[PDB]
Amino acid sequence: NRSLIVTTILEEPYVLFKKSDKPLYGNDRFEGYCIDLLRELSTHLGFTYEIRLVEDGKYGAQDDVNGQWNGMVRELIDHKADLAVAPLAITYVREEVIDFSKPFMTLGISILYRKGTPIDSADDLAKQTKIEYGAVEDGATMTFFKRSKISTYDKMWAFMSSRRQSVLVKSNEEGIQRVLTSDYAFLMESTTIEFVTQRNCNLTQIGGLIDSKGYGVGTPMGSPYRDKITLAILKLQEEGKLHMMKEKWWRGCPE
Amino acid sequence: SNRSLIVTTILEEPYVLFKKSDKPLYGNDRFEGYCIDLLRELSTHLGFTYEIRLVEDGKYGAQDDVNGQWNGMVRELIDHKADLAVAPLAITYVREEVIDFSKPFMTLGISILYRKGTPIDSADDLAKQTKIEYGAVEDGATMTFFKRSKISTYDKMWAFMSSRRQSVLVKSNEEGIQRVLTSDYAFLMESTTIEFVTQRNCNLTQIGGLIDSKGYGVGTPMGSPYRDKITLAILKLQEEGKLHMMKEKWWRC
Ligand SMILES: N[C@@H](CCC(=O)O)C(=O)O
Numbered sequence: 001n002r003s004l005i006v007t008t009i010l011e012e013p014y015v016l017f018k019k020s021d022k023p024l025y026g027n028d029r030f031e032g033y034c035i036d037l038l039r040e041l042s043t044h045l046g047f048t049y050e051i052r053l054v055e056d057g058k059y060g061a062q063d064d065v066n067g068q069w070n071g072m073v074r075e076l077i078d079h080k081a082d083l084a085v086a087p088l089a090i091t092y093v094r095e096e097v098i099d100f101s102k103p104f105m106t107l108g109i110s111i112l113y114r115k116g117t118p119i120d121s122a123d124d125l126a127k128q129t130k131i132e133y134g135a136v137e138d139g140a141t142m143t144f145f146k147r148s149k150i151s152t153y154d155k156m157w158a159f160m161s162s163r164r165q166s167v168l169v170k171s172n173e174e175g176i177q178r179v180l181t182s183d184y185a186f187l188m189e190s191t192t193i194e195f196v197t198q199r200n201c202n203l204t205q206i207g208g209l210i211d212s213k214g215y216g217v218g219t220p221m222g223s224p225y226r227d228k229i230t231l232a233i234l235k236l237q238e239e240g241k242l243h244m245m246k247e248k249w250w251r252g253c254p255e
Numbered sequence: 256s257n258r259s260l261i262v263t264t265i266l267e268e269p270y271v272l273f274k275k276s277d278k279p280l281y282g283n284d285r286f287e288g289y290c291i292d293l294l295r296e297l298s299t300h301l302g303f304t305y306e307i308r309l310v311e312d313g314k315y316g317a318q319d320d321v322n323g324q325w326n327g328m329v330r331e332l333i334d335h336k337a338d339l340a341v342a343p344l345a346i347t348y349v350r351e352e353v354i355d356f357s358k359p360f361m362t363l364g365i366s367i368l369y370r371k372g373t374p375i376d377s378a379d380d381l382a383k384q385t386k387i388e389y390g391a392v393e394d395g396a397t398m399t400f401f402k403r404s405k406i407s408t409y410d411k412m413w414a415f416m417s418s419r420r421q422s423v424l425v426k427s428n429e430e431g432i433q434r435v436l437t438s439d440y441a442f443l444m445e446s447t448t449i450e451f452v453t454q455r456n457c458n459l460t461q462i463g464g465l466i467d468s469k470g471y472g473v474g475t476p477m478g479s480p481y482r483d484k485i486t487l488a489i490l491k492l493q494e495e496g497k498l499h500m501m502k503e504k505w506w507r508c
Protein backbone atom coordinates (compact mmCIF):
# COMPACT_ATOMS: atom_id res chain seq x y z
CA ASN A 1 0.00 0.00 0.00
CA ARG A 2 0.97 3.66 -0.46
CA SER A 3 3.46 5.10 2.04
CA LEU A 4 2.05 7.97 4.02
CA ILE A 5 3.82 11.31 3.64
CA VAL A 6 4.76 12.56 7.13
CA THR A 7 5.66 16.20 7.62
CA THR A 8 7.84 17.10 10.55
CA ILE A 9 10.30 19.69 11.79
CA LEU A 10 13.71 19.57 13.50
CA GLU A 11 13.32 20.07 17.22
CA GLU A 12 15.46 18.31 19.91
CA PRO A 13 14.68 15.77 21.37
CA TYR A 14 11.55 15.15 19.31
CA VAL A 15 13.12 15.07 15.81
CA LEU A 16 16.81 15.25 15.02
CA PHE A 17 19.19 14.26 12.30
CA LYS A 18 21.21 11.27 13.45
CA LYS A 19 24.91 11.90 13.90
CA SER A 20 27.15 9.83 11.62
CA ASP A 21 30.11 10.06 9.29
CA LYS A 22 28.46 8.09 6.48
CA PRO A 23 25.73 9.98 4.67
CA LEU A 24 22.30 8.75 5.64
CA TYR A 25 19.30 8.55 3.29
CA GLY A 26 15.52 8.67 3.58
CA ASN A 27 13.89 7.85 6.86
CA ASP A 28 17.21 6.52 8.20
CA ARG A 29 18.36 10.15 8.63
CA PHE A 30 16.07 10.86 11.59
CA GLU A 31 15.76 9.94 15.24
CA GLY A 32 13.99 11.21 18.33
CA TYR A 33 10.90 10.82 20.50
CA CYS A 34 8.56 11.62 17.60
CA ILE A 35 10.41 9.28 15.30
CA ASP A 36 10.00 6.44 17.85
CA LEU A 37 6.32 7.40 18.10
CA LEU A 38 5.95 7.29 14.32
CA ARG A 39 7.59 3.85 14.20
CA GLU A 40 5.16 2.54 16.82
CA LEU A 41 2.21 4.03 14.95
CA SER A 42 3.36 2.49 11.71
CA THR A 43 3.62 -1.04 13.25
CA HIS A 44 0.34 -0.80 15.12
CA LEU A 45 -1.69 0.62 12.24
CA GLY A 46 0.18 -1.17 9.47
CA PHE A 47 1.49 1.59 7.21
CA THR A 48 4.77 2.58 5.60
CA TYR A 49 5.83 6.21 5.43
CA GLU A 50 8.22 8.81 4.05
CA ILE A 51 9.44 11.57 6.38
CA ARG A 52 9.78 15.08 4.84
CA LEU A 53 10.85 18.19 6.72
CA VAL A 54 8.33 21.00 6.32
CA GLU A 55 9.53 23.16 3.42
CA ASP A 56 9.08 26.55 5.13
CA GLY A 57 10.49 25.46 8.48
CA LYS A 58 7.38 26.56 10.43
CA TYR A 59 4.89 24.97 12.79
CA GLY A 60 2.00 27.05 11.44
CA ALA A 61 0.04 30.22 11.98
CA GLN A 62 -2.56 32.21 10.04
CA ASP A 63 -1.62 35.38 8.19
CA ASP A 64 -3.61 38.27 9.65
CA VAL A 65 -4.03 40.06 6.30
CA ASN A 66 -4.54 37.32 3.67
CA GLY A 67 -5.79 34.52 5.93
CA GLN A 68 -3.44 31.83 4.65
CA TRP A 69 -1.83 29.27 6.97
CA ASN A 70 1.82 28.26 6.73
CA GLY A 71 4.03 25.52 8.15
CA MET A 72 2.99 21.95 8.82
CA VAL A 73 -0.62 23.05 9.31
CA ARG A 74 -0.72 24.38 5.74
CA GLU A 75 0.85 21.20 4.38
CA LEU A 76 -2.04 19.23 5.90
CA ILE A 77 -4.72 21.70 4.70
CA ASP A 78 -3.36 21.35 1.20
CA HIS A 79 -3.14 17.54 1.39
CA LYS A 80 0.62 17.66 0.77
CA ALA A 81 1.17 15.48 3.84
CA ASP A 82 -0.95 12.67 5.31
CA LEU A 83 0.31 13.14 8.87
CA ALA A 84 2.29 15.72 10.85
CA VAL A 85 4.30 13.87 13.51
CA ALA A 86 6.09 16.51 15.54
CA PRO A 87 5.69 18.47 18.80
CA LEU A 88 2.63 20.09 17.25
CA ALA A 89 0.36 21.79 19.74
CA ILE A 90 -3.35 21.07 19.58
CA THR A 91 -5.00 24.51 19.59
CA TYR A 92 -8.46 25.96 18.94
CA VAL A 93 -7.47 27.83 15.78
CA ARG A 94 -5.66 24.82 14.35
CA GLU A 95 -8.43 22.36 15.18
CA GLU A 96 -10.78 24.56 13.16
CA VAL A 97 -8.79 23.77 9.99
CA ILE A 98 -6.99 20.42 10.54
CA ASP A 99 -7.72 17.37 12.66
CA PHE A 100 -5.56 16.16 15.54
CA SER A 101 -5.24 12.89 17.40
CA LYS A 102 -5.70 13.03 21.12
CA PRO A 103 -2.53 14.12 22.89
CA PHE A 104 0.58 12.03 23.26
CA MET A 105 2.11 14.57 25.67
CA THR A 106 0.76 17.38 27.83
CA LEU A 107 2.50 20.65 28.52
CA GLY A 108 2.05 24.39 28.85
CA ILE A 109 3.76 27.61 27.91
CA SER A 110 6.30 28.75 30.50
CA ILE A 111 9.46 30.91 30.68
CA LEU A 112 13.09 29.97 30.18
CA TYR A 113 15.59 32.36 31.74
CA ARG A 114 18.87 32.58 33.63
CA LYS A 115 19.03 31.68 37.31
CA GLY A 116 19.58 33.98 40.25
CA THR A 117 17.19 36.81 39.42
CA PRO A 118 14.09 38.28 41.05
CA ILE A 119 11.94 37.47 37.98
CA ASP A 120 9.28 34.98 39.13
CA SER A 121 6.39 35.22 36.64
CA ALA A 122 5.11 36.52 33.30
CA ASP A 123 3.71 39.54 35.20
CA ASP A 124 7.27 40.43 36.24
CA LEU A 125 8.39 40.43 32.58
CA ALA A 126 5.31 42.29 31.36
CA LYS A 127 5.87 45.26 33.65
CA GLN A 128 9.39 46.03 32.39
CA THR A 129 11.44 46.28 29.17
CA LYS A 130 15.13 45.93 30.17
CA ILE A 131 14.86 42.12 29.98
CA GLU A 132 13.53 41.37 26.53
CA TYR A 133 11.35 38.36 25.85
CA GLY A 134 9.92 36.53 22.89
CA ALA A 135 8.81 33.27 21.27
CA VAL A 136 9.12 31.21 18.11
CA GLU A 137 7.63 33.02 15.14
CA ASP A 138 4.49 31.41 13.66
CA GLY A 139 4.09 28.83 16.41
CA ALA A 140 1.49 28.19 19.04
CA THR A 141 3.14 30.25 21.80
CA MET A 142 3.24 33.34 19.56
CA THR A 143 -0.38 32.72 18.59
CA PHE A 144 -1.48 32.36 22.21
CA PHE A 145 -0.03 35.79 22.98
CA LYS A 146 -1.32 37.36 19.79
CA ARG A 147 -4.88 36.21 20.61
CA SER A 148 -4.95 36.62 24.37
CA LYS A 149 -7.37 39.02 26.09
CA ILE A 150 -5.71 38.55 29.46
CA SER A 151 -4.16 41.90 30.44
CA THR A 152 -0.65 40.59 31.24
CA TYR A 153 -0.45 38.56 28.04
CA ASP A 154 -1.90 41.31 25.88
CA LYS A 155 0.80 43.67 27.24
CA MET A 156 3.45 41.05 26.47
CA TRP A 157 2.15 40.66 22.95
CA ALA A 158 2.30 44.40 22.32
CA PHE A 159 5.97 44.29 23.36
CA MET A 160 6.77 41.22 21.22
CA SER A 161 5.04 42.66 18.24
CA SER A 162 6.86 46.04 18.61
CA ARG A 163 10.22 44.26 18.94
CA ARG A 164 9.46 41.34 16.69
CA GLN A 165 12.50 41.59 14.40
CA SER A 166 14.67 41.04 17.44
CA VAL A 167 12.62 39.00 19.89
CA LEU A 168 10.68 36.56 17.65
CA VAL A 169 12.99 33.76 16.58
CA LYS A 170 12.81 31.02 14.00
CA SER A 171 13.49 28.07 16.31
CA ASN A 172 13.72 27.05 19.90
CA GLU A 173 17.46 26.64 19.35
CA GLU A 174 17.67 30.37 18.39
CA GLY A 175 15.66 31.32 21.48
CA ILE A 176 17.99 29.34 23.78
CA GLN A 177 20.98 31.04 22.21
CA ARG A 178 19.38 34.42 22.90
CA VAL A 179 18.85 33.48 26.57
CA LEU A 180 22.49 32.40 26.84
CA THR A 181 23.97 35.44 25.12
CA SER A 182 21.74 38.39 26.07
CA ASP A 183 19.34 39.62 28.73
CA TYR A 184 16.40 37.74 27.32
CA ALA A 185 13.71 35.38 28.61
CA PHE A 186 12.16 32.92 26.18
CA LEU A 187 8.47 31.91 26.27
CA MET A 188 8.82 28.18 25.55
CA GLU A 189 6.80 24.98 25.97
CA SER A 190 7.42 23.30 29.33
CA THR A 191 8.37 19.88 27.90
CA THR A 192 11.17 21.53 25.94
CA ILE A 193 12.17 23.64 28.95
CA GLU A 194 12.61 20.42 30.94
CA PHE A 195 14.99 19.10 28.28
CA VAL A 196 16.99 22.32 28.07
CA THR A 197 17.37 22.92 31.81
CA GLN A 198 18.62 19.36 32.34
CA ARG A 199 21.46 20.22 29.95
CA ASN A 200 22.09 23.90 30.74
CA CYS A 201 22.61 24.17 34.48
CA ASN A 202 22.59 27.98 34.47
CA LEU A 203 19.06 28.09 33.01
CA THR A 204 15.76 27.54 34.73
CA GLN A 205 12.00 27.64 34.30
CA ILE A 206 10.45 30.84 35.67
CA GLY A 207 7.05 30.44 37.27
CA GLY A 208 4.54 27.79 36.37
CA LEU A 209 2.54 26.93 33.30
CA ILE A 210 0.71 29.80 31.64
CA ASP A 211 -1.72 27.47 29.85
CA SER A 212 -2.43 23.80 29.31
CA LYS A 213 -2.26 22.00 26.01
CA GLY A 214 -1.25 18.76 24.37
CA TYR A 215 0.81 17.68 21.37
CA GLY A 216 -1.09 15.57 18.86
CA VAL A 217 -0.52 14.02 15.46
CA GLY A 218 -1.97 16.33 12.83
CA THR A 219 -4.05 15.08 9.89
CA PRO A 220 -6.05 16.82 7.19
CA MET A 221 -9.60 17.60 8.24
CA GLY A 222 -11.72 14.44 7.95
CA SER A 223 -8.82 11.98 7.75
CA PRO A 224 -9.68 8.41 8.83
CA TYR A 225 -6.22 8.19 10.38
CA ARG A 226 -7.05 10.68 13.13
CA ASP A 227 -9.22 8.36 15.25
CA LYS A 228 -7.00 5.31 14.54
CA ILE A 229 -3.95 7.21 15.76
CA THR A 230 -5.85 8.34 18.84
CA LEU A 231 -6.56 4.70 19.66
CA ALA A 232 -2.96 3.69 19.13
CA ILE A 233 -1.76 6.53 21.36
CA LEU A 234 -4.19 5.55 24.12
CA LYS A 235 -2.93 1.96 23.90
CA LEU A 236 0.72 3.04 23.96
CA GLN A 237 -0.04 5.17 26.99
CA GLU A 238 -1.77 2.32 28.82
CA GLU A 239 1.19 0.00 28.14
CA GLY A 240 3.70 2.53 29.54
CA LYS A 241 5.42 2.98 26.22
CA LEU A 242 5.02 6.78 26.02
CA HIS A 243 6.50 7.22 29.46
CA MET A 244 9.41 5.01 28.50
CA MET A 245 9.92 6.97 25.34
CA LYS A 246 9.97 10.25 27.27
CA GLU A 247 12.50 8.87 29.75
CA LYS A 248 14.70 7.64 26.86
CA TRP A 249 14.82 11.05 25.13
CA TRP A 250 14.83 13.34 28.18
CA ARG A 251 17.58 11.26 29.90
CA GLY A 252 21.61 16.42 35.11
CA CYS A 253 22.63 19.41 37.24
CA PRO A 254 24.12 19.88 40.74
CA GLU A 255 21.61 21.06 43.37
CA SER B 256 -37.34 24.54 19.70
CA ASN B 257 -34.74 21.81 19.56
CA ARG B 258 -34.95 18.77 21.82
CA SER B 259 -32.98 19.21 25.03
CA LEU B 260 -29.93 16.98 25.26
CA ILE B 261 -29.90 14.30 27.92
CA VAL B 262 -26.68 14.63 29.89
CA THR B 263 -25.65 11.67 32.04
CA THR B 264 -23.41 12.29 34.99
CA ILE B 265 -22.51 10.91 38.43
CA LEU B 266 -22.14 12.39 41.90
CA GLU B 267 -18.47 13.05 42.64
CA GLU B 268 -17.17 16.03 44.55
CA PRO B 269 -16.12 18.65 43.42
CA TYR B 270 -17.12 17.77 39.84
CA VAL B 271 -20.84 17.12 40.44
CA LEU B 272 -22.75 17.57 43.67
CA PHE B 273 -26.21 18.28 44.94
CA LYS B 274 -26.48 21.88 46.11
CA LYS B 275 -27.11 22.28 49.82
CA SER B 276 -30.41 23.94 50.51
CA ASP B 277 -33.37 23.79 52.83
CA LYS B 278 -36.05 24.25 50.14
CA PRO B 279 -36.30 21.35 47.69
CA LEU B 280 -34.59 22.00 44.38
CA TYR B 281 -35.84 20.78 40.96
CA GLY B 282 -34.39 19.75 37.63
CA ASN B 283 -31.04 21.09 36.64
CA ASP B 284 -31.13 23.56 39.53
CA ARG B 285 -30.29 20.69 41.90
CA PHE B 286 -26.69 20.36 40.77
CA GLU B 287 -23.44 22.26 41.06
CA GLY B 288 -19.70 21.65 40.57
CA TYR B 289 -16.87 21.92 38.06
CA CYS B 290 -18.59 19.72 35.53
CA ILE B 291 -21.86 21.57 35.93
CA ASP B 292 -20.05 24.85 35.20
CA LEU B 293 -18.43 23.19 32.20
CA LEU B 294 -21.80 21.97 30.93
CA ARG B 295 -23.26 25.45 31.28
CA GLU B 296 -20.40 26.89 29.21
CA LEU B 297 -20.82 24.22 26.56
CA SER B 298 -24.56 24.83 26.35
CA THR B 299 -24.02 28.62 25.92
CA HIS B 300 -21.27 28.21 23.32
CA LEU B 301 -22.91 25.45 21.24
CA GLY B 302 -26.51 26.58 21.67
CA PHE B 303 -28.32 23.65 23.23
CA THR B 304 -30.57 23.11 26.20
CA TYR B 305 -30.20 20.03 28.39
CA GLU B 306 -31.55 17.84 31.16
CA ILE B 307 -29.09 16.38 33.67
CA ARG B 308 -29.77 12.77 34.69
CA LEU B 309 -27.65 10.79 37.18
CA VAL B 310 -26.49 7.53 35.62
CA GLU B 311 -29.06 4.96 36.56
CA ASP B 312 -26.70 2.18 37.66
CA GLY B 313 -24.36 4.52 39.56
CA LYS B 314 -21.27 3.41 37.59
CA TYR B 315 -18.63 5.06 35.39
CA GLY B 316 -18.41 2.04 33.10
CA ALA B 317 -16.53 -1.20 32.47
CA GLN B 318 -16.99 -4.25 30.25
CA ASP B 319 -18.13 -7.57 31.66
CA ASP B 320 -15.56 -10.23 30.81
CA VAL B 321 -18.11 -13.04 30.42
CA ASN B 322 -20.89 -11.41 28.37
CA GLY B 323 -18.99 -8.48 26.87
CA GLN B 324 -21.55 -5.85 27.85
CA TRP B 325 -20.68 -2.40 29.16
CA ASN B 326 -22.30 -0.69 32.15
CA GLY B 327 -22.43 2.83 33.62
CA MET B 328 -22.33 6.07 31.69
CA VAL B 329 -20.43 4.33 28.90
CA ARG B 330 -23.34 1.95 28.35
CA GLU B 331 -25.89 4.81 28.49
CA LEU B 332 -24.03 6.44 25.59
CA ILE B 333 -23.71 3.22 23.62
CA ASP B 334 -27.44 2.68 23.90
CA HIS B 335 -28.34 6.32 23.10
CA LYS B 336 -29.92 6.76 26.53
CA ALA B 337 -27.92 9.95 26.88
CA ASP B 338 -26.60 12.45 24.34
CA LEU B 339 -23.56 13.46 26.41
CA ALA B 340 -21.73 12.32 29.54
CA VAL B 341 -20.34 15.38 31.36
CA ALA B 342 -18.49 14.00 34.34
CA PRO B 343 -14.92 13.15 35.46
CA LEU B 344 -14.99 10.41 32.81
CA ALA B 345 -11.53 9.12 31.89
CA ILE B 346 -10.62 8.83 28.23
CA THR B 347 -9.24 5.30 27.85
CA TYR B 348 -8.39 2.95 24.98
CA VAL B 349 -11.13 0.44 25.71
CA ARG B 350 -13.76 3.16 26.07
CA GLU B 351 -12.70 5.03 22.90
CA GLU B 352 -13.29 1.78 21.04
CA VAL B 353 -17.02 1.95 21.83
CA ILE B 354 -17.88 5.64 22.52
CA ASP B 355 -16.45 8.92 21.31
CA PHE B 356 -14.80 11.49 23.61
CA SER B 357 -13.98 15.13 23.27
CA LYS B 358 -10.38 16.12 23.79
CA PRO B 359 -9.52 16.44 27.47
CA PHE B 360 -10.68 19.23 29.74
CA MET B 361 -8.36 18.14 32.58
CA THR B 362 -5.37 15.82 32.85
CA LEU B 363 -4.57 13.46 35.67
CA GLY B 364 -3.16 10.06 36.55
CA ILE B 365 -3.82 7.22 38.92
CA SER B 366 -2.07 7.59 42.29
CA ILE B 367 -2.44 6.43 45.90
CA LEU B 368 -4.39 7.98 48.80
CA TYR B 369 -3.34 6.86 52.28
CA ARG B 370 -2.93 8.14 55.83
CA LYS B 371 0.09 10.24 56.72
CA GLY B 372 3.06 8.76 58.54
CA THR B 373 4.16 5.72 56.58
CA PRO B 374 7.26 4.24 54.94
CA ILE B 375 5.08 3.20 51.98
CA ASP B 376 6.34 5.31 49.07
CA SER B 377 5.02 3.71 45.89
CA ALA B 378 2.80 1.13 44.29
CA ASP B 379 5.79 -1.30 44.39
CA ASP B 380 5.88 -1.00 48.20
CA LEU B 381 2.13 -1.79 48.37
CA ALA B 382 2.30 -4.70 45.98
CA LYS B 383 5.00 -6.43 47.97
CA GLN B 384 2.86 -6.73 51.11
CA THR B 385 -0.63 -7.62 52.26
CA LYS B 386 -1.03 -6.12 55.76
CA ILE B 387 -2.21 -2.85 54.21
CA GLU B 388 -5.12 -3.64 51.88
CA TYR B 389 -5.70 -1.58 48.78
CA GLY B 390 -8.39 -1.19 46.10
CA ALA B 391 -10.25 1.10 43.72
CA VAL B 392 -13.74 2.06 42.53
CA GLU B 393 -15.54 -0.92 41.06
CA ASP B 394 -16.19 -0.65 37.31
CA GLY B 395 -14.18 2.50 36.78
CA ALA B 396 -11.06 3.32 34.83
CA THR B 397 -8.61 2.68 37.66
CA MET B 398 -9.96 -0.85 38.22
CA THR B 399 -9.80 -1.45 34.48
CA PHE B 400 -6.22 -0.23 34.22
CA PHE B 401 -5.16 -2.76 36.85
CA LYS B 402 -7.26 -5.55 35.41
CA ARG B 403 -5.63 -5.06 31.99
CA SER B 404 -2.07 -4.25 32.99
CA LYS B 405 0.84 -6.48 32.02
CA ILE B 406 3.30 -4.51 34.14
CA SER B 407 4.50 -6.85 36.92
CA THR B 408 3.75 -4.56 39.89
CA TYR B 409 0.26 -3.71 38.63
CA ASP B 410 -0.59 -7.30 37.64
CA LYS B 411 0.35 -8.39 41.16
CA MET B 412 -1.88 -5.65 42.58
CA TRP B 413 -4.79 -6.72 40.40
CA ALA B 414 -4.47 -10.32 41.56
CA PHE B 415 -4.79 -9.08 45.15
CA MET B 416 -7.66 -6.73 44.39
CA SER B 417 -9.54 -9.38 42.46
CA SER B 418 -9.04 -11.96 45.24
CA ARG B 419 -10.31 -9.49 47.85
CA ARG B 420 -12.76 -7.63 45.65
CA GLN B 421 -15.83 -7.86 47.87
CA SER B 422 -13.93 -5.98 50.52
CA VAL B 423 -11.50 -3.76 48.61
CA LEU B 424 -13.43 -2.64 45.50
CA VAL B 425 -15.84 0.10 46.52
CA LYS B 426 -18.78 1.80 44.92
CA SER B 427 -17.60 5.44 45.04
CA ASN B 428 -14.60 7.53 45.82
CA GLU B 429 -16.38 8.60 49.00
CA GLU B 430 -16.54 4.95 50.17
CA GLY B 431 -12.84 4.54 49.39
CA ILE B 432 -11.97 7.58 51.49
CA GLN B 433 -13.99 6.20 54.39
CA ARG B 434 -12.07 2.94 54.13
CA VAL B 435 -8.75 4.83 54.26
CA LEU B 436 -9.93 6.65 57.38
CA THR B 437 -11.34 3.64 59.22
CA SER B 438 -8.99 0.74 58.32
CA ASP B 439 -5.47 -0.01 57.15
CA TYR B 440 -6.27 0.58 53.52
CA ALA B 441 -4.73 2.56 50.69
CA PHE B 442 -6.99 3.75 47.87
CA LEU B 443 -5.99 3.88 44.19
CA MET B 444 -7.55 7.21 43.22
CA GLU B 445 -7.19 9.72 40.36
CA SER B 446 -4.76 12.50 41.19
CA THR B 447 -7.14 15.42 40.67
CA THR B 448 -9.49 13.89 43.22
CA ILE B 449 -6.59 13.22 45.64
CA GLU B 450 -5.67 16.86 45.42
CA PHE B 451 -9.19 17.84 46.49
CA VAL B 452 -9.35 15.29 49.33
CA THR B 453 -5.96 16.01 50.84
CA GLN B 454 -6.67 19.75 50.94
CA ARG B 455 -9.79 18.95 53.01
CA ASN B 456 -8.38 16.25 55.28
CA CYS B 457 -4.93 16.96 56.59
CA ASN B 458 -4.53 13.42 57.97
CA LEU B 459 -4.34 12.04 54.37
CA THR B 460 -1.69 12.21 51.69
CA GLN B 461 -0.80 11.14 48.19
CA ILE B 462 1.75 8.30 48.12
CA GLY B 463 4.17 8.22 45.23
CA GLY B 464 3.68 9.89 41.90
CA LEU B 465 1.37 9.26 38.97
CA ILE B 466 1.12 5.68 37.74
CA ASP B 467 -0.24 6.73 34.34
CA SER B 468 -1.42 9.72 32.36
CA LYS B 469 -4.92 10.31 31.08
CA GLY B 470 -7.52 13.00 30.52
CA TYR B 471 -11.16 13.50 31.36
CA GLY B 472 -13.34 14.14 28.30
CA VAL B 473 -17.00 14.61 27.49
CA GLY B 474 -18.40 11.30 26.31
CA THR B 475 -20.71 11.01 23.35
CA PRO B 476 -22.12 8.02 21.47
CA MET B 477 -19.85 6.83 18.71
CA GLY B 478 -20.32 8.96 15.63
CA SER B 479 -21.91 11.91 17.42
CA PRO B 480 -21.49 15.31 15.74
CA TYR B 481 -21.24 16.89 19.17
CA ARG B 482 -17.85 15.33 19.86
CA ASP B 483 -15.76 17.59 17.63
CA LYS B 484 -17.90 20.64 18.47
CA ILE B 485 -17.28 20.08 22.19
CA THR B 486 -13.56 19.60 21.54
CA LEU B 487 -13.49 23.06 19.90
CA ALA B 488 -15.40 24.64 22.77
CA ILE B 489 -13.06 23.09 25.32
CA LEU B 490 -9.99 24.31 23.39
CA LYS B 491 -11.44 27.82 23.29
CA LEU B 492 -12.25 27.73 27.01
CA GLN B 493 -8.74 26.56 27.71
CA GLU B 494 -7.21 29.37 25.63
CA GLU B 495 -9.25 31.98 27.49
CA GLY B 496 -8.19 30.60 30.89
CA LYS B 497 -11.68 29.63 31.88
CA LEU B 498 -10.91 25.97 32.71
CA HIS B 499 -8.13 26.91 35.06
CA MET B 500 -10.42 29.43 36.67
CA MET B 501 -13.09 26.76 37.12
CA LYS B 502 -10.55 24.41 38.67
CA GLU B 503 -9.41 27.11 41.09
CA LYS B 504 -13.03 27.81 42.03
CA TRP B 505 -13.86 24.18 42.90
CA TRP B 506 -10.47 23.09 44.38
CA ARG B 507 -10.13 26.31 46.46
CA CYS B 508 -3.51 21.75 54.89
N1 LIG C 1 5.19 23.39 19.46
C1 LIG C 1 4.83 24.76 18.94
C2 LIG C 1 6.08 25.54 18.51
C3 LIG C 1 6.89 26.02 19.68
C4 LIG C 1 6.24 27.18 20.44
O1 LIG C 1 5.31 27.80 19.86
O2 LIG C 1 6.61 27.43 21.59
C5 LIG C 1 3.79 24.64 17.87
O3 LIG C 1 3.16 23.54 17.72
O4 LIG C 1 3.53 25.64 17.19
Ligand SMILES: N[C@@H](CCC(=O)O)C(=O)O
Pocket residue numbers: 315316343344345391392394395396397398443444445
Ligand atom coordinates in the same frame (compact mmCIF):
# COMPACT_ATOMS: atom_id res chain seq x y z
N1 LIG D 1 -13.05 8.72 36.80
C1 LIG D 1 -13.07 7.24 36.77
C2 LIG D 1 -13.71 6.65 38.03
C3 LIG D 1 -12.76 6.74 39.23
C4 LIG D 1 -11.60 5.80 39.17
O1 LIG D 1 -11.68 4.82 38.41
O2 LIG D 1 -10.59 6.03 39.89
C5 LIG D 1 -13.74 6.76 35.51
O3 LIG D 1 -13.87 7.56 34.55
O4 LIG D 1 -14.00 5.56 35.43
Ligand SMILES: [Cl-]
Pocket residue numbers: 236237238239240241242243244468
Ligand atom coordinates in the same frame (compact mmCIF):
# COMPACT_ATOMS: atom_id res chain seq x y z
CL1 LIG E 1 2.56 6.27 28.93
Ligand SMILES: [Cl-]
Pocket residue numbers: 100101102230356357358486
Ligand atom coordinates in the same frame (compact mmCIF):
# COMPACT_ATOMS: atom_id res chain seq x y z
CL1 LIG F 1 -10.53 13.69 19.14
Ligand code: NA
Pocket residue numbers: 009010011057171
Ligand atom coordinates in the same frame (compact mmCIF):
# COMPACT_ATOMS: atom_id res chain seq x y z
NA1 NA G 1 13.40 23.66 13.03
Ligand code: NA
Pocket residue numbers: 094095096097098099100221
Ligand atom coordinates in the same frame (compact mmCIF):
# COMPACT_ATOMS: atom_id res chain seq x y z
NA1 NA H 1 -10.32 19.60 13.62
Ligand code: NA
Pocket residue numbers: 350351352353354355356477
Ligand atom coordinates in the same frame (compact mmCIF):
# COMPACT_ATOMS: atom_id res chain seq x y z
NA1 NA I 1 -14.25 6.54 19.93
Ligand code: NA
Pocket residue numbers: 371372373
Ligand atom coordinates in the same frame (compact mmCIF):
# COMPACT_ATOMS: atom_id res chain seq x y z
NA1 NA J 1 0.66 4.65 60.69
